Design a protein around this nucleic acid. Sequence first.
DNA 1: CGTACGTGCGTTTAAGCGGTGCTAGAGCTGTCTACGACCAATTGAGCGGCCTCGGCACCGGGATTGTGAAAAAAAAAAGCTGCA
Length: 98
Amino acid sequence: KRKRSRKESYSIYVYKVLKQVHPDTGISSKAMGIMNSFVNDIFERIAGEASRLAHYNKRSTITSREIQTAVRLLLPGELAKHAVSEGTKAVTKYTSAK
DNA sequence: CGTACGTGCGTTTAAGCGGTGCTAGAGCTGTCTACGACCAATTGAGCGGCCTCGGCACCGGGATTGTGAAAAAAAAAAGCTGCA
Ligand SMILES: [Ca+2]
Ligand SMILES: [Ca+2]
Ligand SMILES: [Ca+2]
């Protein structure tokens, strides 16, 4: 009768994104396992590339510029273009919401 | 068995050297504050747990697709000449 320990996952957000993308389409347990393995992976790859960018330039802080550079380094062409576009929107919209 | 490449010639080219002169820009300083750590207190987003019900796995049965043989038609190909 102990409550089971927490296990975070991006799965509520994957669903919310899916419901934008294809409102009438769902996803199996194991397909979610993968979408989660993905998000974590690309997270770890970008954070890691952004870490090294900072570290090379003798920088204490990983800013949104070290992410963007790390995104250009990591992503293929049109993914990178679109990935930067959506990132740069997000920060602009954040700042105008104070 | 055909000609694509390696060899080796003579001719041509610009890489490499060693040097000189100009300056963009790498990299350093010192200054100063906007921003991020840390903090505590506050609170609602996301967790586990639970219950439901519709998608999809599983089924049988018939429709449609794809292969291979067999017999048959078309096919190149094979032993025989003449005529020059
Ligand atoms: Ca500043
Ligand atoms: Ca749940
Ligand atoms: Ca349902």
